[PDB]
PDB file of C-alpha atoms and ligand atoms in Angstrom:
ATOM      1  CA  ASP E 109     -91.875 -24.308  71.510  1.00  0.00           C
ATOM      2  CA  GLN E 110     -88.470 -22.747  70.946  1.00  0.00           C
ATOM      3  CA  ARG E 111     -87.360 -20.336  73.674  1.00  0.00           C
ATOM      4  CA  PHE E 112     -85.213 -17.558  72.231  1.00  0.00           C
ATOM      5  CA  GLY E 113     -84.258 -14.996  74.818  1.00  0.00           C
ATOM      6  CA  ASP E 114     -87.506 -13.887  76.434  1.00  0.00           C
ATOM      7  CA  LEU E 115     -89.645 -14.848  73.411  1.00  0.00           C
ATOM      8  CA  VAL E 116     -91.147 -18.117  72.206  1.00  0.00           C
ATOM      9  CA  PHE E 117     -91.389 -19.357  68.602  1.00  0.00           C
ATOM     10  CA  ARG E 118     -93.531 -22.264  67.396  1.00  0.00           C
ATOM     11  CA  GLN E 119     -93.698 -23.714  63.894  1.00  0.00           C
ATOM     12  CA  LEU E 120     -97.344 -24.055  62.817  1.00  0.00           C
ATOM     13  CA  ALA E 121     -96.910 -25.260  59.223  1.00  0.00           C
ATOM     14  CA  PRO E 122     -93.964 -25.647  56.815  1.00  0.00           C
ATOM     15  CA  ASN E 123     -93.508 -21.892  56.101  1.00  0.00           C
ATOM     16  CA  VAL E 124     -95.356 -20.439  59.127  1.00  0.00           C
ATOM     17  CA  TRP E 125     -94.253 -19.708  62.692  1.00  0.00           C
ATOM     18  CA  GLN E 126     -95.945 -18.050  65.650  1.00  0.00           C
ATOM     19  CA  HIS E 127     -93.983 -15.468  67.634  1.00  0.00           C
ATOM     20  CA  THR E 128     -94.841 -14.863  71.271  1.00  0.00           C
ATOM     21  CA  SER E 129     -93.714 -12.031  73.543  1.00  0.00           C
ATOM     22  CA  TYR E 130     -94.645 -11.006  77.094  1.00  0.00           C
ATOM     23  CA  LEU E 131     -95.380  -7.797  78.962  1.00  0.00           C
ATOM     24  CA  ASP E 132     -95.540  -7.866  82.765  1.00  0.00           C
ATOM     25  CA  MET E 133     -98.866  -5.952  82.926  1.00  0.00           C
ATOM     26  CA  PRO E 134     -99.213  -4.374  86.402  1.00  0.00           C
ATOM     27  CA  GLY E 135    -102.306  -5.811  88.139  1.00  0.00           C
ATOM     28  CA  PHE E 136    -102.857  -8.803  85.832  1.00  0.00           C
ATOM     29  CA  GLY E 137     -99.594 -10.675  85.158  1.00  0.00           C
ATOM     30  CA  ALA E 138     -97.206 -11.358  82.301  1.00  0.00           C
ATOM     31  CA  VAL E 139     -99.422 -11.221  79.238  1.00  0.00           C
ATOM     32  CA  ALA E 140     -98.489 -13.272  76.165  1.00  0.00           C
ATOM     33  CA  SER E 141     -99.135 -11.848  72.710  1.00  0.00           C
ATOM     34  CA  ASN E 142     -98.810 -13.834  69.488  1.00  0.00           C
ATOM     35  CA  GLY E 143     -98.082 -12.849  65.910  1.00  0.00           C
ATOM     36  CA  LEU E 144     -96.905 -14.647  62.781  1.00  0.00           C
ATOM     37  CA  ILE E 145     -93.854 -15.096  60.590  1.00  0.00           C
ATOM     38  CA  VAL E 146     -94.356 -16.423  57.039  1.00  0.00           C
ATOM     39  CA  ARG E 147     -91.724 -17.462  54.518  1.00  0.00           C
ATOM     40  CA  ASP E 148     -92.896 -16.704  50.976  1.00  0.00           C
ATOM     41  CA  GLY E 149     -90.207 -18.108  48.696  1.00  0.00           C
ATOM     42  CA  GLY E 150     -87.099 -15.968  49.137  1.00  0.00           C
ATOM     43  CA  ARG E 151     -88.552 -13.466  51.593  1.00  0.00           C
ATOM     44  CA  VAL E 152     -90.207 -13.293  54.988  1.00  0.00           C
ATOM     45  CA  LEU E 153     -93.452 -11.523  55.961  1.00  0.00           C
ATOM     46  CA  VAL E 154     -94.365 -10.574  59.540  1.00  0.00           C
ATOM     47  CA  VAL E 155     -97.798 -10.143  61.126  1.00  0.00           C
ATOM     48  CA  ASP E 156     -97.696  -7.945  64.261  1.00  0.00           C
ATOM     49  CA  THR E 157     -94.781  -6.656  66.261  1.00  0.00           C
ATOM     50  CA  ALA E 158     -93.942  -7.815  69.760  1.00  0.00           C
ATOM     51  CA  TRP E 159     -94.880  -5.562  72.690  1.00  0.00           C
ATOM     52  CA  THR E 160     -91.611  -3.639  72.526  1.00  0.00           C
ATOM     53  CA  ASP E 161     -88.910  -2.500  70.141  1.00  0.00           C
ATOM     54  CA  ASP E 162     -86.315  -4.670  71.911  1.00  0.00           C
ATOM     55  CA  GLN E 163     -88.532  -7.754  71.647  1.00  0.00           C
ATOM     56  CA  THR E 164     -89.270  -6.993  67.993  1.00  0.00           C
ATOM     57  CA  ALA E 165     -85.548  -6.723  67.241  1.00  0.00           C
ATOM     58  CA  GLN E 166     -85.312 -10.198  68.820  1.00  0.00           C
ATOM     59  CA  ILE E 167     -87.961 -11.501  66.405  1.00  0.00           C
ATOM     60  CA  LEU E 168     -85.783 -10.195  63.570  1.00  0.00           C
ATOM     61  CA  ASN E 169     -82.717 -11.873  65.146  1.00  0.00           C
ATOM     62  CA  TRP E 170     -84.590 -15.170  65.329  1.00  0.00           C
ATOM     63  CA  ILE E 171     -85.591 -14.803  61.679  1.00  0.00           C
ATOM     64  CA  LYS E 172     -81.954 -14.158  60.723  1.00  0.00           C
ATOM     65  CA  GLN E 173     -80.844 -17.308  62.607  1.00  0.00           C
ATOM     66  CA  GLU E 174     -83.642 -19.702  61.615  1.00  0.00           C
ATOM     67  CA  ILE E 175     -84.637 -18.540  58.108  1.00  0.00           C
ATOM     68  CA  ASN E 176     -81.888 -16.156  56.963  1.00  0.00           C
ATOM     69  CA  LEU E 177     -83.907 -14.331  54.301  1.00  0.00           C
ATOM     70  CA  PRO E 178     -84.911 -10.658  54.086  1.00  0.00           C
ATOM     71  CA  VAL E 179     -88.099  -9.478  55.771  1.00  0.00           C
ATOM     72  CA  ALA E 180     -89.994  -7.813  52.913  1.00  0.00           C
ATOM     73  CA  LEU E 181     -92.826  -6.305  54.949  1.00  0.00           C
ATOM     74  CA  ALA E 182     -94.816  -6.361  58.143  1.00  0.00           C
ATOM     75  CA  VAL E 183     -98.525  -5.796  58.659  1.00  0.00           C
ATOM     76  CA  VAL E 184     -99.854  -4.886  62.107  1.00  0.00           C
ATOM     77  CA  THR E 185    -103.413  -5.614  63.113  1.00  0.00           C
ATOM     78  CA  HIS E 186    -104.422  -2.566  65.227  1.00  0.00           C
ATOM     79  CA  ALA E 187    -103.028   0.348  67.227  1.00  0.00           C
ATOM     80  CA  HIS E 188    -102.382  -1.300  70.596  1.00  0.00           C
ATOM     81  CA  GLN E 189     -98.963  -2.025  72.068  1.00  0.00           C
ATOM     82  CA  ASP E 190     -99.099  -5.796  71.693  1.00  0.00           C
ATOM     83  CA  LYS E 191     -99.500  -5.416  67.914  1.00  0.00           C
ATOM     84  CA  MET E 192     -97.666  -2.153  67.124  1.00  0.00           C
ATOM     85  CA  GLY E 193     -95.334  -1.486  70.055  1.00  0.00           C
ATOM     86  CA  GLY E 194     -92.246  -2.480  68.054  1.00  0.00           C
ATOM     87  CA  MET E 195     -92.764  -0.369  64.937  1.00  0.00           C
ATOM     88  CA  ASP E 196     -89.514   1.578  65.459  1.00  0.00           C
ATOM     89  CA  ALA E 197     -87.537  -1.692  65.437  1.00  0.00           C
ATOM     90  CA  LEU E 198     -89.091  -2.643  62.093  1.00  0.00           C
ATOM     91  CA  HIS E 199     -88.210   0.776  60.667  1.00  0.00           C
ATOM     92  CA  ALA E 200     -84.666   0.615  62.012  1.00  0.00           C
ATOM     93  CA  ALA E 201     -84.337  -2.707  60.166  1.00  0.00           C
ATOM     94  CA  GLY E 202     -85.526  -1.159  56.862  1.00  0.00           C
ATOM     95  CA  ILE E 203     -88.750  -3.187  56.720  1.00  0.00           C
ATOM     96  CA  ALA E 204     -91.777  -1.759  54.884  1.00  0.00           C
ATOM     97  CA  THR E 205     -94.714  -1.484  57.269  1.00  0.00           C
ATOM     98  CA  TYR E 206     -98.477  -1.562  56.748  1.00  0.00           C
ATOM     99  CA  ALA E 207    -101.538  -1.015  58.919  1.00  0.00           C
ATOM    100  CA  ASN E 208    -105.216  -0.170  58.516  1.00  0.00           C
ATOM    101  CA  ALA E 209    -105.467   3.546  57.658  1.00  0.00           C
ATOM    102  CA  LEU E 210    -107.510   3.921  60.857  1.00  0.00           C
ATOM    103  CA  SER E 211    -104.725   2.288  62.908  1.00  0.00           C
ATOM    104  CA  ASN E 212    -102.234   4.793  61.507  1.00  0.00           C
ATOM    105  CA  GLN E 213    -104.621   7.645  62.309  1.00  0.00           C
ATOM    106  CA  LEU E 214    -105.042   6.373  65.885  1.00  0.00           C
ATOM    107  CA  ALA E 215    -101.387   5.462  66.428  1.00  0.00           C
ATOM    108  CA  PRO E 216    -100.095   8.724  67.924  1.00  0.00           C
ATOM    109  CA  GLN E 217    -102.932   9.047  70.486  1.00  0.00           C
ATOM    110  CA  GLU E 218    -102.495   5.363  71.406  1.00  0.00           C
ATOM    111  CA  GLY E 219     -98.771   5.942  72.035  1.00  0.00           C
ATOM    112  CA  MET E 220     -97.767   3.994  68.907  1.00  0.00           C
ATOM    113  CA  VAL E 221     -95.566   4.892  65.967  1.00  0.00           C
ATOM    114  CA  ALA E 222     -97.576   4.713  62.723  1.00  0.00           C
ATOM    115  CA  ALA E 223     -96.783   2.268  59.957  1.00  0.00           C
ATOM    116  CA  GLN E 224     -95.356   3.715  56.743  1.00  0.00           C
ATOM    117  CA  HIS E 225     -98.298   2.636  54.583  1.00  0.00           C
ATOM    118  CA  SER E 226    -102.046   2.564  55.017  1.00  0.00           C
ATOM    119  CA  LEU E 227    -104.384  -0.236  54.009  1.00  0.00           C
ATOM    120  CA  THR E 228    -107.913   0.650  52.951  1.00  0.00           C
ATOM    121  CA  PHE E 229    -110.845  -1.729  52.623  1.00  0.00           C
ATOM    122  CA  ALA E 230    -113.785  -2.359  50.329  1.00  0.00           C
ATOM    123  CA  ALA E 231    -117.305  -2.248  51.814  1.00  0.00           C
ATOM    124  CA  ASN E 232    -117.269  -6.071  52.056  1.00  0.00           C
ATOM    125  CA  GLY E 233    -114.109  -5.993  54.182  1.00  0.00           C
ATOM    126  CA  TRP E 234    -111.429  -7.227  51.756  1.00  0.00           C
ATOM    127  CA  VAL E 235    -108.358  -5.052  51.532  1.00  0.00           C
ATOM    128  CA  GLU E 236    -108.147  -2.856  48.453  1.00  0.00           C
ATOM    129  CA  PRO E 237    -105.408  -4.697  46.534  1.00  0.00           C
ATOM    130  CA  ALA E 238    -103.506  -1.574  45.487  1.00  0.00           C
ATOM    131  CA  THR E 239    -102.869  -0.745  49.154  1.00  0.00           C
ATOM    132  CA  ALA E 240    -101.342  -4.177  49.933  1.00  0.00           C
ATOM    133  CA  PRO E 241     -98.732  -4.568  47.190  1.00  0.00           C
ATOM    134  CA  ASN E 242     -96.516  -7.652  47.252  1.00  0.00           C
ATOM    135  CA  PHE E 243     -98.396  -9.229  50.158  1.00  0.00           C
ATOM    136  CA  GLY E 244     -98.019 -12.686  48.547  1.00  0.00           C
ATOM    137  CA  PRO E 245    -100.036 -15.234  50.525  1.00  0.00           C
ATOM    138  CA  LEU E 246    -101.251 -12.713  53.129  1.00  0.00           C
ATOM    139  CA  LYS E 247    -104.949 -12.041  52.597  1.00  0.00           C
ATOM    140  CA  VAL E 248    -106.068  -9.094  54.677  1.00  0.00           C
ATOM    141  CA  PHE E 249    -109.673  -8.656  55.818  1.00  0.00           C
ATOM    142  CA  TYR E 250    -111.400  -5.995  57.926  1.00  0.00           C
ATOM    143  CA  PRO E 251    -114.228  -7.856  59.705  1.00  0.00           C
ATOM    144  CA  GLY E 252    -115.870  -4.812  61.287  1.00  0.00           C
ATOM    145  CA  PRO E 253    -115.364  -3.214  64.698  1.00  0.00           C
ATOM    146  CA  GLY E 254    -114.937  -5.589  67.632  1.00  0.00           C
ATOM    147  CA  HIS E 255    -111.948  -5.714  69.933  1.00  0.00           C
ATOM    148  CA  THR E 256    -111.221  -2.267  68.509  1.00  0.00           C
ATOM    149  CA  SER E 257    -112.676  -0.141  65.715  1.00  0.00           C
ATOM    150  CA  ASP E 258    -109.555  -0.720  63.603  1.00  0.00           C
ATOM    151  CA  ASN E 259    -108.902  -4.451  64.119  1.00  0.00           C
ATOM    152  CA  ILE E 260    -107.912  -6.374  60.988  1.00  0.00           C
ATOM    153  CA  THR E 261    -107.335 -10.068  60.279  1.00  0.00           C
ATOM    154  CA  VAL E 262    -105.083 -12.066  57.970  1.00  0.00           C
ATOM    155  CA  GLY E 263    -105.439 -15.392  56.157  1.00  0.00           C
ATOM    156  CA  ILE E 264    -102.405 -17.255  54.839  1.00  0.00           C
ATOM    157  CA  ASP E 265    -103.014 -18.653  51.371  1.00  0.00           C
ATOM    158  CA  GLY E 266    -101.568 -22.126  50.808  1.00  0.00           C
ATOM    159  CA  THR E 267    -102.208 -23.067  54.440  1.00  0.00           C
ATOM    160  CA  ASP E 268    -105.130 -23.879  56.702  1.00  0.00           C
ATOM    161  CA  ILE E 269    -104.356 -20.848  58.878  1.00  0.00           C
ATOM    162  CA  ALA E 270    -106.219 -17.612  59.573  1.00  0.00           C
ATOM    163  CA  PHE E 271    -105.153 -15.015  62.137  1.00  0.00           C
ATOM    164  CA  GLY E 272    -107.801 -13.245  64.185  1.00  0.00           C
ATOM    165  CA  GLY E 273    -105.463 -11.095  66.275  1.00  0.00           C
ATOM    166  CA  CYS E 274    -107.081  -9.821  69.450  1.00  0.00           C
ATOM    167  CA  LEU E 275    -110.612 -10.151  68.020  1.00  0.00           C
ATOM    168  CA  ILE E 276    -110.735 -13.919  68.581  1.00  0.00           C
ATOM    169  CA  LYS E 277    -110.266 -15.817  71.869  1.00  0.00           C
ATOM    170  CA  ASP E 278    -109.950 -19.604  72.115  1.00  0.00           C
ATOM    171  CA  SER E 279    -112.802 -22.045  72.546  1.00  0.00           C
ATOM    172  CA  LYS E 280    -112.271 -22.367  76.324  1.00  0.00           C
ATOM    173  CA  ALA E 281    -111.850 -18.636  77.065  1.00  0.00           C
ATOM    174  CA  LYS E 282    -113.868 -17.281  79.993  1.00  0.00           C
ATOM    175  CA  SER E 283    -114.099 -13.693  78.672  1.00  0.00           C
ATOM    176  CA  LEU E 284    -113.360 -11.350  75.765  1.00  0.00           C
ATOM    177  CA  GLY E 285    -110.274  -9.876  77.501  1.00  0.00           C
ATOM    178  CA  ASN E 286    -109.489  -6.170  77.050  1.00  0.00           C
ATOM    179  CA  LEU E 287    -112.741  -4.476  75.971  1.00  0.00           C
ATOM    180  CA  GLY E 288    -111.577  -0.934  76.841  1.00  0.00           C
ATOM    181  CA  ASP E 289    -111.691   0.130  73.177  1.00  0.00           C
ATOM    182  CA  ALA E 290    -114.256  -2.437  72.029  1.00  0.00           C
ATOM    183  CA  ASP E 291    -117.407  -2.009  69.973  1.00  0.00           C
ATOM    184  CA  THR E 292    -119.884  -4.003  72.071  1.00  0.00           C
ATOM    185  CA  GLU E 293    -122.743  -3.742  69.567  1.00  0.00           C
ATOM    186  CA  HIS E 294    -120.827  -5.076  66.560  1.00  0.00           C
ATOM    187  CA  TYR E 295    -118.334  -7.496  68.127  1.00  0.00           C
ATOM    188  CA  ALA E 296    -120.346 -10.679  67.539  1.00  0.00           C
ATOM    189  CA  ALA E 297    -121.036  -9.898  63.881  1.00  0.00           C
ATOM    190  CA  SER E 298    -117.383  -8.966  63.319  1.00  0.00           C
ATOM    191  CA  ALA E 299    -116.149 -12.249  64.813  1.00  0.00           C
ATOM    192  CA  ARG E 300    -118.580 -14.138  62.561  1.00  0.00           C
ATOM    193  CA  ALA E 301    -117.496 -12.098  59.517  1.00  0.00           C
ATOM    194  CA  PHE E 302    -113.874 -13.131  60.146  1.00  0.00           C
ATOM    195  CA  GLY E 303    -114.976 -16.776  60.098  1.00  0.00           C
ATOM    196  CA  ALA E 304    -116.995 -16.278  56.917  1.00  0.00           C
ATOM    197  CA  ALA E 305    -114.057 -14.579  55.150  1.00  0.00           C
ATOM    198  CA  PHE E 306    -111.766 -17.584  55.720  1.00  0.00           C
ATOM    199  CA  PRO E 307    -114.197 -20.527  55.592  1.00  0.00           C
ATOM    200  CA  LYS E 308    -111.551 -23.201  54.886  1.00  0.00           C
ATOM    201  CA  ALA E 309    -109.208 -22.153  57.714  1.00  0.00           C
ATOM    202  CA  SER E 310    -109.076 -24.998  60.239  1.00  0.00           C
ATOM    203  CA  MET E 311    -106.304 -23.503  62.391  1.00  0.00           C
ATOM    204  CA  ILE E 312    -107.229 -20.199  63.990  1.00  0.00           C
ATOM    205  CA  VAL E 313    -104.309 -18.210  65.402  1.00  0.00           C
ATOM    206  CA  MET E 314    -104.957 -15.340  67.785  1.00  0.00           C
ATOM    207  CA  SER E 315    -103.157 -12.888  70.016  1.00  0.00           C
ATOM    208  CA  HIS E 316    -103.807 -14.233  73.504  1.00  0.00           C
ATOM    209  CA  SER E 317    -104.445 -17.955  73.163  1.00  0.00           C
ATOM    210  CA  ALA E 318    -102.638 -20.859  71.519  1.00  0.00           C
ATOM    211  CA  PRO E 319    -103.848 -21.881  68.060  1.00  0.00           C
ATOM    212  CA  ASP E 320    -107.271 -23.527  68.117  1.00  0.00           C
ATOM    213  CA  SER E 321    -109.985 -24.946  65.901  1.00  0.00           C
ATOM    214  CA  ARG E 322    -112.813 -22.871  64.460  1.00  0.00           C
ATOM    215  CA  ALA E 323    -114.593 -23.341  67.805  1.00  0.00           C
ATOM    216  CA  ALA E 324    -112.534 -20.282  68.806  1.00  0.00           C
ATOM    217  CA  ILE E 325    -114.635 -18.252  66.362  1.00  0.00           C
ATOM    218  CA  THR E 326    -118.020 -19.674  67.346  1.00  0.00           C
ATOM    219  CA  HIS E 327    -117.249 -19.392  71.077  1.00  0.00           C
ATOM    220  CA  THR E 328    -115.937 -15.841  70.753  1.00  0.00           C
ATOM    221  CA  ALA E 329    -119.037 -14.801  68.805  1.00  0.00           C
ATOM    222  CA  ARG E 330    -121.367 -16.525  71.270  1.00  0.00           C
ATOM    223  CA  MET E 331    -119.718 -14.702  74.188  1.00  0.00           C
ATOM    224  CA  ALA E 332    -119.952 -11.459  72.198  1.00  0.00           C
ATOM    225  CA  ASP E 333    -123.709 -12.043  71.776  1.00  0.00           C
ATOM    226  CA  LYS E 334    -123.926 -11.217  75.511  1.00  0.00           C
ATOM    227  CA  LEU E 335    -122.420  -7.728  74.930  1.00  0.00           C
ATOM    228  CA  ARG E 336    -125.493  -6.636  72.925  1.00  0.00           C
TER     229      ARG E 336
HETATM  230  O1  LIG I  15    -104.484  -5.486  72.315  1.00  0.00           O
HETATM  231 ZN1  LIG I  16    -105.819  -4.589  71.248  1.00  0.00          ZN
HETATM  232 ZN1  LIG I  17    -104.291  -7.825  72.476  1.00  0.00          ZN
END
């Protein structure tokens, strides 16, 4: 771990880092949220903001210090604060932003600023390629409704890594966390669909646990079986 102001950065693979930020959540504690930073040749790609604009500006500062290449785009994985709370900071920095069309639709009512561009998805869940131009190694997949109706996931080509966002919890998790906006009927199938989309991914990264094996996926789905 590298502490950088109030955030934490951890290298996961040669061109991939995890960013972590915290929100002191009244009546629960200081909740960590993770996203990703990927170097693709001469540019950087970001998955998820931090909780806040100030924290997200700090992610960009860290990138400037440790990579020193332009951030070409960011993709955010649903319309909750941990994933989209720093959209204004990305826009202030001139970074092109992307989210599920449904996330952009929901953003205002969720208290988020919408991304500039909307991703749409084929019936099988893969992003429609025209809506994710210049995504390089980022392979975006909509697994179905689970943690939220709009949750999306991202594999990183050239690595063993897939990112489940808030859909997936680690293999020792006691619960499925914040289910306030969850789809209880479809959660288990959506978790399994994420696994099936990225079958070779041996490192599963997620919002609220450290990176884990694929047991994160099986355990999450098995817990979600109890929601039905
Ligand atoms: O979330
Ligand atoms: Zn969420
Ligand atoms: Zn979350």
